[PDB]
Amino acid sequence: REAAVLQKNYLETQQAQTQAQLAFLQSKFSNAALYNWLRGRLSAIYYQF
Amino acid sequence: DKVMAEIDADKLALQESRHGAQSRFDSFNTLYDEDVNAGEKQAMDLYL
Instruction: Tell whether the torsion through CA atoms of A26, A31, A33 and A34 is positive or negative.
Output: positive
Helix (H) and strand (E) counts for chain A?
A: 2, 0
> What's this structure's resolution in Å?
2.8
CA–CA gap between residue A44 and residue A32 (Å, rounded): 18
Work out the end-to-end distance of chain B between its first and last CA atoms, rounded to an integer number of angstroms: 70
Q: How far is A21 from chain B (nearest CA, A)?
A: 29
Work out the end-to-end distance of chain A between its first and last CA atoms, rounded to an integer number of angstroms: 68
Q: Residues B44, B36: contact at Cβ < 8 Å? A: yes
Residues 6+ apart with CB under 8 A from A21: none
Which residue of chain B comes nearest to A7, CA vs CA?
Answer: B2
Which residue of chain A comes nearest to B1, CA vs CA?
Answer: A3
Please state how this structure was obtained.
cryo-EM
Probe site for chain A from B1, B2, B10 (most A CB atoms < 10 A): B2
